Amino acid sequence: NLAPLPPHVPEHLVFDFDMYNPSNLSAGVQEAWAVLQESNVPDLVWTRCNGGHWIATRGQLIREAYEDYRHFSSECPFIPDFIPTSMDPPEQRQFRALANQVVGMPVVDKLENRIQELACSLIESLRPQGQCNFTEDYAEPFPIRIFMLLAGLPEEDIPHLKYLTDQMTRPDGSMTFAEAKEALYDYLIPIIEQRRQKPGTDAISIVANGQVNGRPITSDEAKRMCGLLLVGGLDTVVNFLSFSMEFLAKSPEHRQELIERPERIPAACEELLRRFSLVADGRILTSDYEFHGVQLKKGDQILLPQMLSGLDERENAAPMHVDFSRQKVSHTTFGHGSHLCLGQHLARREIIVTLKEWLTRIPDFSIAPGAQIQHKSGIVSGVQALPLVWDPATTKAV
Numbered sequence: 096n097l098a099p100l101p102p103h104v105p106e107h108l109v110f111d112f113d114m115y116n117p118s119n120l121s122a123g124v125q126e127a128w129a130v131l132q133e134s135n136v137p138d139l140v141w142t143r144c145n146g147g148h149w150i151a152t153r154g155q156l157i158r159e160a161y162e163d164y165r166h167f168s169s170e171c172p173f174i175p176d177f178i179p180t181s182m183d184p185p186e187q188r189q190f191r192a193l194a195n196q197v198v199g200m201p202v203v204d205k206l207e208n209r210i211q212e213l214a215c216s217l218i219e220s221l222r223p224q225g226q227c228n229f230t231e232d233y234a235e236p237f238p239i240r241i242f243m244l245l246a247g248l249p250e251e252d253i254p255h256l257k258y259l260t261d262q263m264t265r266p267d268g269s270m271t272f273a274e275a276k277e278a279l280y281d282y283l284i285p286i287i288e289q290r291r292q293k294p295g296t297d298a299i300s301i302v303a304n305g306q307v308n309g310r311p312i313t314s315d316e317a318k319r320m321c322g323l324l325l326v327g328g329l330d331t332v333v334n335f336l337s338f339s340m341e342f343l344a345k346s347p348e349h350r351q352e353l354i355e356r357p358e359r360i361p362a363a364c365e366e367l368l369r370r371f372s373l374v375a376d377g378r379i380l381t382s383d384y385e386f387h388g389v390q391l392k393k394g395d396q397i398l399l400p401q402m403l404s405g406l407d408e409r410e411n412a413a414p415m416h417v418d419f420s421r422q423k424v425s426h427t428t429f430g431h432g433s434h435l436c437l438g439q440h441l442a443r444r445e446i447i448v449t450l451k452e453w454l455t456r457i458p459d460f461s462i463a464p465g466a467q468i469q470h471k472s473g474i475v476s477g478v479q480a481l482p483l484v485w486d487p488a489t490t491k492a493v
């Protein structure tokens with residue numbers, strides 16, 4: 096399972112961390128990754144797992160590498176074709192500017208109460224049941240319905256669209272990754288063509304009618320962009336909301352704090368994004384490069400885990416402790432550098448709206464008795480399931 100050590104890599108830097116199956120997973124996924132930050136582990140290591148690749152383990156190095164796109168390229172962002180995820184500057188700036196017209200802060204401010212109405216109807220349908228699988232019953236339906244809202248798409252298309260995106264990250268075997276992607280494209284293409292002719296004020300209409308390098312955007316470019324806008328906000332949001340609700344279910348004192356001080360909910364959102372950070376992307380070396388005393392070779396892959404920066408004790412004191420009143424919350428949960436999450440403003444509103452509406456309607460809830468919560472590790476780390484229970488008599492319809 097281990098790849099043989101390339102000759103340019105010294106043995107003393109070898110630490111065989113498996114990002115898809117870390118040894119301490121049962122202690123919780125963030126904890127399992129933080130093994131990389133023990134005092135005997137150098138800031139830059141090589142693992143022989145998953146083809147062999149570098150891992151930067153400290154916030155300083157993670158930030159620096161994400162800044163230096165000239166040495167650390169996005170052409171190969173995964174260990175071991177959406178736009179703009181695979182492009183370096185300067186072509187990236189064009190598509191990034193266009194995508195920002197659909198998910199940027201002004202759009203998020205316009206949709207805030209639509210987001211709230213969606214959260215309310217979901218929670219209200221669960222409230223009288225006294226139980227749910229949060230991941231399945233709230234976290235999954237929420238971001239897909241936000242996308243249908245953004246893209247002006249009908250409710251009846253959800254089951255099939257949801258299935259297609261599920262096949263890309265959690266295949267049941269019906270479809271290869273390529274087949275799911277093309278089916279997704281089969282779906283988007285006619286909508287794009289039609290909204291070239293009769294535009295609305297939706298995200299597909301904007302992307303379809305956009306300009307890159309003097310002339311109109313192609314259908315190939317529009318489809319691969321709309322595709323990323325869809326998938327970019329699903330798994331991250333589903334899994335992040337799950338880590339957050341797991342913690343709040345296990346910490347009645349933190350629940351109480353936000354119940355008593357609702358004005359702290361946006362700071363709490365930021366501290367949860369630090370503690371339960373979940374993305375680990377990477378880059379490929381464009382050339383030989385000596386980085387902080389270490390010889391990196393052209394073509395080497397390097398994992399730069401966005402998750403690790405906020406957990407670094409050099410960045411935040413007592414990093415495993417959740418403290419909604421931290422003066423300085425330092426993290427790279429949405430990334431850093433030219434590819435910084437375009438959905439970051441939408442995500443923060445999704446999180447804040449969720450916490451406000453859930454705590455308003457179902458203030459007291461616990462993990463279902465006897466349930467053990469299981470985490471999973473990957474490019475986007477997550478929660479397998481979150482069985483929650485409450486007493487309907489302690490809830491309120493609002």
Ligand code: HEM
Nearest residue numbers: 179180327328331332335374376429430434436437438442
């Ligand atoms: C908690 C939720 C989210 C997290 C943790 C997150 C995290 C990230 C990270 C780390 C990146 C950069 C990856 C890299 O540099 O290789 C990224 C990029 C991106 N995200 Fe998110 N994201 C979230 C929500 C969303 C949402 C809601 C959307 C849209 C609906 C979205 C759309 C995008 C897009 C389009 C990019 C590509 C930016 C570029 O390459 O220029 N994200 N996200």
